[PDB]
Every structure is written in structure tokens, then in C-alpha cells.
Amino acid sequence: MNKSRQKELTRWLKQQSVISQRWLNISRLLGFVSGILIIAQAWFMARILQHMIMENIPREALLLPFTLLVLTFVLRAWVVWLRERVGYHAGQHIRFAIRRQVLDRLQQAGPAWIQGKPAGSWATLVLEQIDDMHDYYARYLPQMALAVSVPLLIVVAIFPSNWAAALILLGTAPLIPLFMALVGMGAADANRRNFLALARLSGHFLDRLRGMETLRIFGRGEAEIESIRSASEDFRQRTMEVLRLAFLSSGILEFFTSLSIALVAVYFGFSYLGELDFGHYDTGVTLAAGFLALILAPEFFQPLRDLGTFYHAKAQAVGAADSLKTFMETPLAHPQRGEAELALTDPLTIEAEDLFITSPEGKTLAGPLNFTLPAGQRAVLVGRSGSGKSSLLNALSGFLSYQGSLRINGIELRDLSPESWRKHLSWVGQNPQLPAATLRDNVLLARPDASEQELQAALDNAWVSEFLPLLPQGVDTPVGDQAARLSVGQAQRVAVARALLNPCSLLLLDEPAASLDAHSEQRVMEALNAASLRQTTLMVTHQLEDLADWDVIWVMQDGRIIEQGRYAELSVAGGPFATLLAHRQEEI
Amino acid sequence: MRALLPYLALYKRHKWMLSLGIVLAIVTLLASIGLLTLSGWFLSASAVAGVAGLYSFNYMLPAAGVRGAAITRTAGRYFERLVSHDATFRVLQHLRIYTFSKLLPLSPAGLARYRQGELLNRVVADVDTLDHLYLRVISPLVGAFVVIMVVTIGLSFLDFTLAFTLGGIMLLTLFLMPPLFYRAGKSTGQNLTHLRGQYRQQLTAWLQGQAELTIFGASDRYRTQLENTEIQWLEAQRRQSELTALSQAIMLLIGALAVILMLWMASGGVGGNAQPGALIALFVFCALAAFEALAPVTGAFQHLGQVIASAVRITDLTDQKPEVTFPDTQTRVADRVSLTLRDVQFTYPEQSQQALKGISLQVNAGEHIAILGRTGCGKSTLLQLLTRAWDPQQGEILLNDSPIASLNEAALRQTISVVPQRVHLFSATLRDNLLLASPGSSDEALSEILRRVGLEKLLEDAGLNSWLGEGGRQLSGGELRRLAIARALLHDAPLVLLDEPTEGLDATTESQILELLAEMMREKTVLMVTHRLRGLSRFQQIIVMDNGQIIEQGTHAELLARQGRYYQFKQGL
Ligand code: HEM
């Protein structure tokens, strides 16, 4: 709010710039050399013109003071090029470091936190709100270095000749800061509000553009197009109440520059007419000093003019810094690291008592739990939708923190090493994802090398055995981005093959049967039962068919287990499971 | 430049403001140049006149110049800034209005040829690049050209040779260079765009797959690929910056060349005077001041490529042309309407072999008919066709025995109420989000509509006013259906086309919704599409269709007498 946020944003931007100190110092030194070269060029040009305008000297007799001017021009061009390149490198390094930090934090956050935005906010954040930092740093900071350095050098250079021309330039320098800041400014955080409103107007336009379908049905449009016009009028009228004040600084600076130039010209012009006597230093005012004063006067204020051009670069970076600081300071929870490991050849028995599961930000998600899973058994966790069914799966997978005891063959779960625990799992997702290129790679993701018989007898008549003479290539066909070409079920038969390829000890399923055709569902559940017959399995599903084979059925209501038992004992007792099966039967 | 013509023709509305901005910029530059030139000439002339010249040197006249130059420069700078920032906003508003107006008509049969997401953001970014186009491109080029022409003629009034050499130098600098810096720029821009697209794709894939890439140990071999792509992208950016420095270097060198040429040429008889005197400073100072004014042109060439790409993208998106037309001949509506289909064989222009082969049904006034079937049989196609989104490939459709073609936008959109599958909540107040259906209802009408069956928890809140959507409150499907139905009820129409009204719900909410829909509309003709046959016994005509055709039709009691059509003898799911 107001200044209290602008100041801390600027402070954070300044603080996150200690990774290119050498480059910044090099740029400052190069700026110093541009000063000596401007003063050399001016002295040499004045020297040539006082010999050519007075005390007539043949043109072909000034070759010695003529080549040095060309050398100075060449050196200045070289220095400008070097400054540009150094500034770019200094800008790039900070972006590299910041992107690395952001990606590391996102990786450490976990999958639970990531699936909160529609997969576009993160990329927009990273790219768009990270490039502005380089723009700001590289274009702005060397200019701030130059603006204080060059004028003092010019003042020092001019002083030995005349002490009045130097005092003319000195007089203005206090005035512009004080006048500018006090009367003609004081609304600099108010422009942040205008920029935010301008961005929010584009956001509202985007929201309207997404709703074009729901406006066509109700006959709107011509009656809605007035809203955009009214909002734009309001924004313009609100904006032009502060631009009548923020533009006074340019007028003040131009007025001071013109006043300085005019005063220098008038004083030196009337000096030679025998009407003034201030600073001839007991020798006499010569034209070679007047031309030097006239030439160096524009170079005094030129660094300050460029600062006005770079305002849009700084104001754009603050918007990105706001979101970056908001993201990087959010307090999270994270799971607890583990140290212990266990043997690779033993069944896993899971037990718990008074266990709670917490979201990465806060709030309890699964209430109190009480169960016990014998080794080698198959358990199904059915229940009402929106009851936090898919929370025990994430708790076991190590994506969420928890309170209480969760024991994997005696040992707790906060003590297990992830790199030795995740090797015992195998996951089947509700929404498939293919983070590879070739369809063979999306199958061998578990082990990126194998023989030539597992790709034959992987699963069943699935997309690995059948569904081959339908694609215009073999098993190495490049899938593409997010399996765009494979639309039927989003390939819920390659994920199952990937899970079935590697022999595992605890198979977790998360509604694998969603969005498939009848034959595909039949084959998927056949393969799933064949897989679950071999080891301990924990399945969360909504289909209520062929449940007679499952050992124990859990019903989850409001995060609390209510009834546990076999299908025969639980389809008659009249509990919540009876209501669920009755509703499913009333569906048809 | 061809793509910019249809959008350079959009400035014919506001021309006075742009002309004023250009004139003010030109005036400011001319005032600065004149001030510096006058100061230099006065200094040289006063110095060469000497002490014995005070009675032959009228210095009163050259003071008005050095006063007016300063005053004019200051006022011109200030008002030029103000006027430019006004014109930019006006142009932006006009552009947004035009884009929305030209994008509205082609909503259903349009934007479906691409992926709807990540298109609108591109459109917004393109509009921003276009306003940047206007300012950053239009202003400096015209300003510099006019300033150069004026300076050249003013100097030519004295002596032609030096003036035209200076004019040629400036003209060759302005015209030749930007085309010559527009080839490697194009190449590097293409490479950078390709690399950025690849990096974004890989980042999105990694972020989405982080759920499985951790359980199956893989999320270490993809961060490396991301880093390598980032390295290549940074290499391309560096190759572009190394080119962009050369422009400034060459500009400074050209200014030095011009100044040196002036100094050497004006030393030997400028104007026809072997010992000119007090005029050498004139040309040198004029050249210095003029060449320290061409900075805006140097950076103008960077904005051209992005602007051209954005303009051509918007133009291509806009010229996609509509699909159906409206015979806007005026008509009226009636309180009793009916639906009569006889035969439709419709397929999408994209691909072929879809549903709706020979569908035929007749609906009388004030009759409740429910269409049954599986998913994808063609019910949604019928609903989308009935609102004239697409056009019937071959067949006839009649409302009140009148063809559906001869209807205005207002009449068709008013006489038919639709409850869509997906409900969109605008980022505004509850009052604004709900007054879309009927913009004449008072607060009491809204209050009683809410106090009817539906949402009553939002009634108290902080009041009617609130924030709904991303900014504020969030609703669920059970809280969305009873608001969509409220909107439909407020938009009073004799025919109501309800889409799937119960999917993704629970038992009690579904029963309450069914009671609401049976009671609140007992005269309006209703033709809803369902696939959960709960409560489907109060309808007098049930139609069950599959594989894009009608298998059998009849009343519940009569059609249940020939074995379970979907019940499968009352046994199934
Ligand atoms: C509406 C929000 C905006 C505000 C508050 C704003 C404010 C400003 C300010 C403070 C300056 C600098 C004045 C100085 O140097 O003392 C400026 C200059 C400028 N603005 Fe804006 N501006 C806005 C939007 C825009 C837009 C939409 C454009 C068009 C692309 C634009 C183009 C410029 C240009 C070209 C300059 C002068 C040279 C430059 O800095 O690039 N501004 N504006």
C-alpha cells in the first residue's frame, strides 16, 4: 500500500543484485572513461575554432590537432560498445540465478501445491515476470552510476578556466532535486495504482472474452459493449488526474537546461564587449573558454534526460517484483525428511492409529483414521465424492505431511528415505500424463533399458500388443505434447503397461477406470485384477461392479471410515454402502 | 507494411490529436536546435567584433530569440507528452471495442479450429504491441523527417553545398540503415521464437508430470533438458544483443563524421567569402545539435517485427468470416411455442460421419419431453443445432410451423432459454452476475427468486453485493445448477432447452432439483437431455435414442411393457 510497499519492493530489487558486482563496477569505470573522452573532444574543437575564427590560420596547417579528434571519436564508440555488452551480461546473470531458485522451490513444494493453478500461471510467472528484471537492471543501474559521476567531472574540468561559468552549472544542481521532489512531485506510488488498474482492465477484458459463449445465448453483446467503453472512459479520466503533475519534472529540467545555456551564452558574449569583469584571472577572457563552456553545457544534463526515458523500464519491473516477492515469502509446511531404510525382499503391512493428514498450507483433510492392512491383501476405499478419498493415497506416497503414526512394517513413515521408499511403489493415475517423446519411452520410463520380450508380453491386448496396426508407425512413434494425437482415454492403457512393467511391492490406484469404453474398461480391470492378485494393493475407485473378490471394503464419509466388511456382509446391513448401491442401481 | 494498412486506416477517427503531437515534437526539436545555433553564433560574432563594436552591434534583437526558444521548448515538451498520452489511450479503447465487436459473431463456429486456451492471451498481447506500434513507430520517423527537411532548407538559404551535404548525410543515415539491420534480426527472432516455444512446452510437461516423474524415478533427467534449452535461449538472446550494440556505435561514428566534414568544408569560403568569419560556428553547432536529436530513430527498428507479427495474427483471426446469417426482418413472439422436427442429416464441416442421420419427432405446445440415451449418441449435437450454432446440412426445422431461418437475433435469443452444461461466473457482483437474464428486475424480484428453491445461503452474505469467481467467493456444481436454473427462470421464454441438469451431483440435491424443475415451470414447454433415469415417470413422451437414431418412442407405462429398454429387465448398473 502506497509507499510502504514500493520502498520494500525497490529494496528487494536492490538486494537481489549482488551476483554481478564485478560487471557493475566495470560499467562504472567505463562510464568514467567516457567523461575524459568528452572533455578531450571539447578542448580540441575549441582549440581548432579559436584558431580558425580568430588569428586566421591556413586550413592545411592544423593537421596535428585534427587526427586526435578522430582518435577520440573512435575511442568513445569503442567504449560505448563495451558498456552495452557488459550491461547485457550483468543483466543475464541475475535472471539465471533467480530462475534456478524459483524452479528449485517449485520442485521442493511437491505435487500437492502445484495442482492449484491451471498450468499456465506458473509459466506466465516465470517467463514474463523474470525477463523484466534483466530489462530493469541492465538499462537502469549504469545510468544511475553515470548521472552522479559525469557532472562532477565536468564541473572540475571547467573550473580552472573561469570560476563564473563553473558556478553557473553548480547553482542549478541543488535546485532541480529539491524543486522536483517537493513541488511538482510527491505522487510516485500513485502511479503504481494506475498501472495496476491498467493491468486489471486487460484482465477484465480477457474475462469477458472467455465468456463470449454465455453472452450469445442471452442476447447480450450490443448491450454489453457499452461496459468496455464506460470502463475505458473511467480509467482514462482517473489516470489523467495524476499525469498533469508527474509531467512537471520534464518541464522543470528543460527550463533549467535552457536557462543555464542562455546565461552562459549571454555572460560570455557580453564579456568580450568590455561590459563585464568577473573571472578573467588577471589574463583576459578568450574565446577558447567560451566555446568550451558552450560545448560542455549540453553534456551536463544529458545523463539526466536519459533517466526520464528509462522510467517505463523501472515501473514495469516493480510489477513483476511484487508477484515474485509474494510467491517467495509464502509460508508452507512440507513433509519431514527420513533417514532409515529397509530390506527389498519382504511384504509390507500397513497399520495406523489416530492419524491426521494436513494440506501443504493448512486445514485437516482426513480426520482421524483407524485401520490395519494384512500383508498380501487387497483393500478398496469407496465412498462419497468430495470426502477426501484421495488423501490416504497421497499420505502413503509421501506427498503430504501428517500427524500420528503410520507404520510400514513397524517403522514409521517420517523416518524412511524417499530414494529407498519410492522404489517399492507403482502408481496409476486418474488423469494420464506422458512426459516423454517416443511411445516406447513412455513405457520404459521405469527402466530406460530392457530386452525385446517385455514389450511383447507387457500387459494384455492393450496399446502395447494390440492398437499397433492402427498408427502410421511402430512402437517408437513420437507421442507429442501431452498425448494430443492419442485422445481415446488420454492413453489409459500405456500408463497401466508402465506400472505393470516393473515388479513392485505396493500398488496404488487412483480411479484408473475413468473415461474409457466398455471393452477398454473390461480389459483394464482384467489386467488390474491380475496385477493386484500378486501383492498388497490399495485401490480408490467409484465403480461398484465385480467387488465380490475384494477382501475388505471401506466407506469414507467426511474423512471418517464408517463400515468395513466384505461385499456379502455389507450389501445387506443397510448402512451407507447400501444407500450408495441403491443410488447406483436407481441410476438405471 | 501491407498488414499495417488496415490498421493505419483505423486512425481516421482521431487525427487532430496525432497531428498535434507530431507538430509539438517538431516544434520542440526546432526550438532546441535554434537556441544552440543562436548561442554559438552570438558568442563568435561578439568575440570577433571586439571592444570597438558596441555602437555597431544591436544586441537587443537576438535576445527575443533566446527567450522565445526556451519558453517554446519547455511548453512544447510538456504539452507533447500530455497529448501523446491522451491519444494512446483513445486509440487503445477503439482497438479493444473493434476487436471484440468483430470477434463476437463467430463464437460457436469459430475459435474451434484452434485450441481455445492460450489464444486470448495472445490476442491481448497483440493489442498491446499495436498501441506500442502507434507511438514508438509513428512519432519519431515523421518528426525526424520534418526536422531534417526544415534544417536543410534553412541552411540552404545561406549556402547550398554544405547544406545539401548535411541533408544527404542525414537522409542516408535515416533511410538506408534500418532496412540493412532487418535481416539478421529476422533470423535471430525466428530462432528465439522457436526456442521459447520449445522451452515453454518442456516446462509445462515437466510441471504436469511431476506427479509420476517422482514415483518413477525420472525427475532428474528432465531438469537437465530444461537447463540446456534455457542455455540455448540465452545464447540466442546474447547473439541479438551483440547486434543491437552496433547500431549505437555506428550512430555515434556517423555523427562524428558529419561534424568533421562540416568543420573541414566550412573553412574555405562558405557562401563565397575566402575569409568568412563568425559563420564557421554556425554550421558546426547546427550539425552538433541536429545529430544529438536522432536517438529515437535508433531504437525504432526493434519494435517493427513483433508489431507486424501481431497485426498479421489478429488480421488472420478476424477474417475467418461467420458461418450463418440472420434475416433481420422484424417479427413478433407468442406465449405458446412448439418444436417440430421432420428429418435432419447434419455433419460437422470438420471431419464427417457424425450422428443425426434421420431424427424425427413432433412436440406439441406445453408438453414435457425428455431425450434419453448414452454419451455421444447425438443429443448434445441436437441441442447445439437447435440454437442455430451450426446450420442443418439437409432438412427442415419449424417452430410454430414457421422455418427457423426467418428469425432475428433478438427474437431467437429471447424465445429460447438454455441451461448449458458448463456454467460461467463472471468476475463481478452477484447482482451483476445474475442480472444478465433480465436487466429490469428490482432488488425484491431478485430476493424472491433466490428465496425460492435454490440458493438461500448467499442471500445473507454481506448482502447482494459480493465478489464471485476468481477474485472472491467460489461455488460448487450443486451451488451452480440452482443459479443457472434461476437465470433461466428469470429469462422468461416459452421454450426451455435444459442440458444435462443432474450430472455430477448427489441424491438429495438431485431430488430437490427435480422437484424445483417440475414445480417452477409447469406450463413452459421443456425438452431436456438426461442419461440418469431418476424420476423419469412424470413425462408424457419419453424418447430413447442411440447410435444416432431413434430405436423406440412411447410413454413410460406403454413402453415399459416390451421388456426393459435400458432397465435390461430392471437389472443393470
Ligand atoms: C497509462 C499508464 C501510463 C503512465 C502512468 C505513464 C507515465 C509515463 C511517465 C511518467 C513517463 C515519463 C515522463 C518522464 O520522463 O518524466 C512516460 C513516458 C512515456 N510513456 Fe508512458 N505512461 C503510461 C502508459 C504508456 C503507454 C500505454 C505508452 C505507449 C506505448 C507509453 C509511452 C510512453 C513514452 C513513449 C514515453 C516517453 C519515452 C519513453 O519513456 O519511452 N506510456 N509515461
Numbering used by the authors:
A (entry chain B): 1 to 588
B (entry chain A): 1 to 573
The article reads:
CydDC is a prokaryotic ATP-binding cassette (ABC) transporter required for heme assembling in respiratory cytochrome bd oxidase, a promising target for drug discovery. In our structures, CydC and CydD form a heterodimer with each subunit composed of one transmembrane domain (TMD) and one nucleotide-binding domain (NBD). TM4 and TM5 of one subunit associate with TM1-3 and TM6 of another to form a helix bundle in a “domain swapping” manner. The overall fold of CydDC belongs to the type IV family of ABC transporters, commonly known as exporters.
However, the location of heme is not in the middle of TM region or in the central cavity. Crucially, two axial His residues, His85 in TM2C and His312 at the bending point of TM6D, coordinate axially to the central iron atom of the heme from opposite sides. Such a binding pattern, is commonly observed in many heme-associated enzymes, but never seen in other heme transporters. The tetrapyrrole group in heme is further immobilized by many surrounding residues. In the heme-loading structure, the two axial His residues are 4.8 Å away from each other, which is perfect to clamp the iron ion. In the heme-loading structure of EcCydDC, the corresponding distance is shortened to 13.8 Å. There is still a hole left, leading to the heme binding site. Interestingly, the long EH of EcCydD protrudes and interacts with TM4D in the heme-loading structure.
